[PDB]
């Protein structure tokens, strides 16, 4: 029965594979986390540039409602394409170097809509094994053939692409991995997929706004222009939503065939105005300053960890895993940091490889130097 299927799946769960209850917060974005009525330094949010609370983006969100109401009233293919959506699309395309941008309500939605429109059962997706769920789940729920390659292993990927395919091949990877905060070798990857007549799709959720000139992506940084670029706005941009960057013909294909783009409700115009304001800050001199601040904080953290009984991952991202090793030690370490006012969360097998239990830390441009020092001190006294 259905209820037996559900009860049986919930009952079978081992203690290490069960997800904890969601914890309600009063504030979850940026420097401070507020849970109950207690203030914690927040080392768990994705607000990498501190823009969720920026006065200019708040104003834009607010005025946009005055000007346009809230809901768009519908889909882009009827009366839900606002002049504000068109201007944001144009601005993103100009910023990143693509002929076209198409807006989506989330990264999950963008990824699924591209893959649903472009891949048939005959085709193959070659996906990095550590791709985040937004991408992988999309590639899974497709009728195409999904094949994973070892993390960032371009030799493995070439092997994959060389295998006979009855259709076309799409390579998918992230610019900065949600997991370890490490970068993909995009240029090398772009080379072997061209060599096997494939197209390349990069999701740059964790790099967009945060690295490269004017905060352009992981792709800019590495001088690579994949056929498809997906950017999402729930992290560094401090808002919500996503866009697909692409060519004139690919955008025309998606606008004719991608049902997810054609029939979904477009985002509130006021949300798009907040995103245009976020983009402006990201491109501005203040954008450079926030990125430079974030990099200084990462430097301060990594330098302090040298003198600690922990290891670091290969990351220059705001994402800075602290490898602890032992599961009990890591959980007790996170609990203790929380007790001392530092909000962190621990991750253990099997989400991570054996013996690589760790803290999931993130830093943001809203943090201050003394915050990093407070983290280091608690880590020393409990490490």
Domain with 102 in it: what CATH number? 3.40.640.10
**Residue 232 contacts residue 301 (beta carbons within 8 Å):** no
Any idea which residues carry the catalytic annotation?
Answer: 46, 132, 174, 178, 203, 206, 235
Q: How far apart are alpha carbons 250 and 262 in whole angstroms?
A: 15
Q: Which of 47, 60, 31 is nearest to 234 (CA)?
A: 47
202 plus 82 within the same structural domain: yes
| Full strand arrangement of the beta sheet holding 311-312 | 311-312, 322-325, 357-359, 346-347
| C-alpha to C-alpha distance for 95 and 216, rounded to whole angstroms | 7
53 marked as part of a ligand binding site: no
Cis omega (within 30 of 0) on the bond before 316? no
Query: Strand (E) positions, 280-341?
Result: 311-312, 322-325
DSSP letter string, 47-67:
-TTSGGG-HHHHHHHHHHHHH
Please say whether the beta carbons of 237 and 278 come within 8 A. Answer: yes
Alpha carbons 182 and 68: distance in angstroms, whole number: 40
**Residue 176: beta bridge partners?**
183
Angle at 350 between CA 3 and CA 124, to 5 degrees: 80
How many helices (H) and strands (E) the chain has is answered by 14, 14
Ligand-binding site membership of 364 (annotated): no
Domain that holds residue 88: 56-283
Does the annotation place 151 within a ligand binding site?
no
Q: Tokens for 192? A: 């072997």
Residues 151 and 131: their CA atoms lie apart, in Å, by: 9
Judged by DSSP in three states, 73 sits in coil
Residues 29, 166 within the same domain: no
Contact 106, 241 (CB under 8 A): yes
Same domain, 278 and 332: no
Domain stop point among 234, 265, 283: 283
Question: Resolution in angstroms for this experimental structure?
Answer: 1.6
Q: Identify whether residues 264 and 346 lie together within a single domain.
A: no
Residue 105, token pair as written in the block: 């309500």
- In what helix (H) or strand (E) does residue 104 lie, and over which residues does it extend? strand 100-104
CA dihedral angle for residue 181, residue 342, residue 234, residue 58, rounded to 10 degrees: -140
Q: What is the rounded distance in angstroms from the CA atom of residue 59 to the CA atom of residue 167?
A: 49
Q: Where are the beta strands (DSSP E) in 237-356?
A: 242-246, 311-312, 322-325, 342-343, 346-347
Tell whether 147 and 199 lie within a shared domain. Answer: yes
Residue 197 to residue 162: CA distance in whole angstroms:
10
127 in the same domain as 102: yes
**Residue in this structure with the two tokens 């030690």, named with its chain if needed:** 329
Alpha carbons 41 and 341: distance in angstroms, whole number: 6
Number of domains in the chain: 2
232, 258, 283: which is the final residue of a domain?
283
The technique is: X-ray
Q: How far is CA 44 from the centre of its chain?
A: 14
Q: Are residues 261 and 115 in the same domain?
A: yes
112 in any annotated domain: yes
Which residues fall within 8 angstroms of residue 356, CB to CB, at 6 or more apart? 323, 325, 349
CB atoms within 10 A of CB 143: 10
216 assigned ligand-binding residue:
no
User: In this structure, what CATH number is given to the domain that contains residue 327?
Assistant: 3.90.1150.10
């Amino acid at each position: 029965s259905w209820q037996e299927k559900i009860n049986a799946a919930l009952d079978a769960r081992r203690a290490a594979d069960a997800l904890r209850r969601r914890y309600p917060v009063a504030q979850g974005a940026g420097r401070w986390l507020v849970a109950d009525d207690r203030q914690y330094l927040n080392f768990s949010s994705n607000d990498y540039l501190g823009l969720s609370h920026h006065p200019q983006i708040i104003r834009a969100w607010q005025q946009g409602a005055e000007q346009f109401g809230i809901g768009s009233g519908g889909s882009g293919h009827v009366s839900g394409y606002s002049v504000v959506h068109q201007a944001l699309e144009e601005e993103l395309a100009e910023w990143l170097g693509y002929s076209r941008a198409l807006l989506f309500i989330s990264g999950f939605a963008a990824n699924q809509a591209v893959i649903a429109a472009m891949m048939a059962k005959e085709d193959r997706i070659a996906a990095d094994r550590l791709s985040h769920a937004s991408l992988l789940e999309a590639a899974s729920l497709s009728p195409s053939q999904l094949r994973r390659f070892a993390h960032n292993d371009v030799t493995h990927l070439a092997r994959l692409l060389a295998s006979p395919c009855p259709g076309q091949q799409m390579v998918v990877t992230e610019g900065v991995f949600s997991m370890d905060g490490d970068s993909a070798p995009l240029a090398e990857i772009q080379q072997v997929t061209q060599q096997h007549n494939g197209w390349l799709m990069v999701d740059d959720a964790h790099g967009t706004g945060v690295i490269g000139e004017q905060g352009r992506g992981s792709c800019w940084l590495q001088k690579v222009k994949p056929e498809l670029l997906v950017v999402t706005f729930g992290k560094g941009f401090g808002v919500s939503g996503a866009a697909v960057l692409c060519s004139s013909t690919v955008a025309d294909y998606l606008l004719q065939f991608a049902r997810h783009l054609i029939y979904s409700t477009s985002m509130p115009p006021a949300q798009a105005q907040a995103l245009r304001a976020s983009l402006a800050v990201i491109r501005s001199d203040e954008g450079d300053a926030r990125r430079e601040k974030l990099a200084a904080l990462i430097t301060r953290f990594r330098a302090g960890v040298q003198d600690l009984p922990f290891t670091l991952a290969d990351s220059c991202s705001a994402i800075q895993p602290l490898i602890v090793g032992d599961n009990s030690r890591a959980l007790q370490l996170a609990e203790k940091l929380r007790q001392q006012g530092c909000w962190v969360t621990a991750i253990r097998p099997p989400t991570v490889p054996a013996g690589t239990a760790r803290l999931r830390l993130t830093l943001t441009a809203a943090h201050e130097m003394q915050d990093i020092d407070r983290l280091l001190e608690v880590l020393h006294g409990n490490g």
